[PDB]
Amino acid sequence: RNLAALEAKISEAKTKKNMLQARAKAAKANAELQQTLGGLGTSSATSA
Amino acid sequence: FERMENKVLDMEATSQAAGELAGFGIENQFAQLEASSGVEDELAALKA
Amino acid sequence: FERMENKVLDMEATSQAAGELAGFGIENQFAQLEASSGVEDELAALKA
Amino acid sequence: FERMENKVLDMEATSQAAGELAGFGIENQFAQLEASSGVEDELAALKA
Amino acid sequence: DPEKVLEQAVIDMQEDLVQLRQAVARTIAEEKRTEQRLNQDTQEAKKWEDRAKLALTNGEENLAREALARKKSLTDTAAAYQTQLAQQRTMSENLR
Amino acid sequence: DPEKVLEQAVIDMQEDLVQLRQAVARTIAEEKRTEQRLNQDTQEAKKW
Amino acid sequence: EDRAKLALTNGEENLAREALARKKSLTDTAAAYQTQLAQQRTMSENLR
């Protein structure tokens, strides 16, 4: 029973962390695209 | 969970800072222009 | 709590000094101008 | 018997310490979830 | 010269918009992969439901309740992947 | 600084609460060992 | 709250009252963060 619970706990913990890491990386990539479009684009346009 | 939560707090703080500092009223004016453009295509579909 | 209370008393004394020494009547005249500007936008919305 | 009794007292003290310090209420909540899961399989067998 | 500055700024914007195309293509792949995951989890949930139907046909209610507990775990996992997919869909549309 | 004093006080409290966990674990072992003693004495009383 | 609903479904009113005490602590903590948030909102608007 301890082994069955241990493997379930490990499997759930790893898969939840892995999908959270993937969604965090996607979310920060979308945010970083707003930072480059806002910071580089408006500065370049205003300078032109 | 501690390392994941530290990166989640960085992404949430980054997301708050982007919407708080740069969520300007002009984006709602662009959304009103996009809605007005959608109404013009519905009027074109009605005319057709 | 003693260190926190000493910094709270510094921030409260700073906040009192700012409002007491420099809370000039002109800021209420600016608030009346902002209210008058808000009424002019409500009259523009009524006219529209 | 003296050497055996010394190891028996070590195992009994270890067993007391584990159940006393870490026999948390959440293990009874997990046992209630396992009982609830067993009732759901008996309801599935009744439905079949 | 302001003409050279604005031309270089527009060249730098070509590199940035190509990074945004790469970020869209990545986000498209992540939404399609989490769809693929929840699709196969729901197909395995159907296999476990048919394993329960076979167990009930044999009269083994114990195996039927266990197979239904596998179905419950898989459909809850597919709902977690649907929740993650909703974040990938909105991010994909935001980048688009 | 009061922030550094209260942070250090809370760090010292982590060491103290870990000593209290060790004292609980010891006390749990002592109650389990005196239960084991009276349990075996009552089993020997049945043999007699 | 759902842990309390599960406890009441199992008939464990002791666990239900404990789970409701966790709910009370969390909602009081959220009201403390709402009180702090009100200070951050007014400061954010003042700086804006």
Report residue B18 as tokens. Answer: 């982007």
Q: Residue count of chain D, please give it.
A: 48
In chain F, which residue's Cα lies nearest the Cα of D22?
Answer: F25
Contact D41 E69 (CB under 8 A): yes
> Which DSSP letter does residue F16 get?
H
Q: Are D38 and E65 in contact (CB under 8 A)?
A: yes
Q: Are B27 and A44 in contact (CB under 8 A)?
A: no
Question: How far is it, in rounded angstroms, from Cα B28 to Cα B25?
Answer: 5
Contact F1 C1 (CB under 8 A): no
> Which DSSP letter does residue A24 get?
H
Question: How far is it, in rounded angstroms, from Cα E26 to Cα E24?
Answer: 5
Residues B18-33, buried b or exposed e (16+ Cβ, 10 A)?
eeeeeeeeeeeeeeee
Residues of D in Cβ contact (< 8 Å) with E66: 41
Residues contacting residue D15 through CB under 8 Å, at least 6 positions apart: F32
- Subunits that touch chain A (at least 3 Cβ pairs < 8 angstroms)? B, E
Q: Treating both helix axes as pointing N-terminal to C-terminal, what angle do D2-22 and F2-47 enclose, rounded to 10 degrees? A: 130
Residues of F in Cβ contact (< 8 Å) with D20: 24-25, 27-29, 31-32
Q: Are F27 and D7 in contact (CB under 8 A)?
A: no
Question: How far is it, in rounded angstroms, from Cα D25 to Cα D23?
Answer: 7
Q: Are F26 and D19 in contact (CB under 8 A)?
A: no
Question: How far is it, in rounded angstroms, from Cα E40 to Cα E78?
Answer: 9
Give 3-state DSSP helix, strand, coil % of chain A, rounded to 5: 95, 0, 5
Report residue E55 as tokens. Answer: 């167990």
Residues of A in Cβ contact (< 8 Å) with E81: 19
- Subunits that touch chain G (at least 3 Cβ pairs < 8 angstroms)? D
How close A28 gets to chain B, by Cα (Å)?
A: 6
3-state secondary structure of E96: coil
Residues D9-41, buried b or exposed e (16+ Cβ, 10 A)?
eeebbeebbeebbeeeeeeebeebeeeeeeeeb
Report residue G13 as tokens. Answer: 């009113």
Residues of G in Cβ contact (< 8 Å) with D24: none
Longest dimension (CA), chain D: 59
Cα distance from N-terminal residue to C-terminal residue, chain B: 58
Contact C4 F2 (CB under 8 A): yes
The experimental technique used to determine this model is cryo-EM
Q: Are E12 and A40 in contact (CB under 8 A)?
A: yes
Provide Rg for chain G, Cα atoms.
17
Report residue E47 as tokens. Answer: 């296999």
Residues of A in Cβ contact (< 8 Å) with E94: 30
* Whether D19 contacts chain F with CB within 8 A: yes
Amino acid in the structure at residue D42: E
Query: Resolution in A, one decimal?
Result: 7.8
Q: Residue count of chain C, please give it.
A: 48
Nearest to D12 among F24, F26, F36 (CB): F36
Question: How far is it, in rounded angstroms, from Cα B32 to Cα B26?
Answer: 10
How close E9 gets to chain A, by Cα (Å)?
A: 5
Question: How far is it, in rounded angstroms, from Cα B39 to Cα E82?
Answer: 32
Residues contacting residue D4 through CB under 8 Å, at least 6 positions apart: none
Residues of A in Cβ contact (< 8 Å) with B4: 17, 20-21, 24
In Å, how far from its chain's centre is CA C24? 10
Chains D and F touch (3+ CB pairs under 8 A): yes
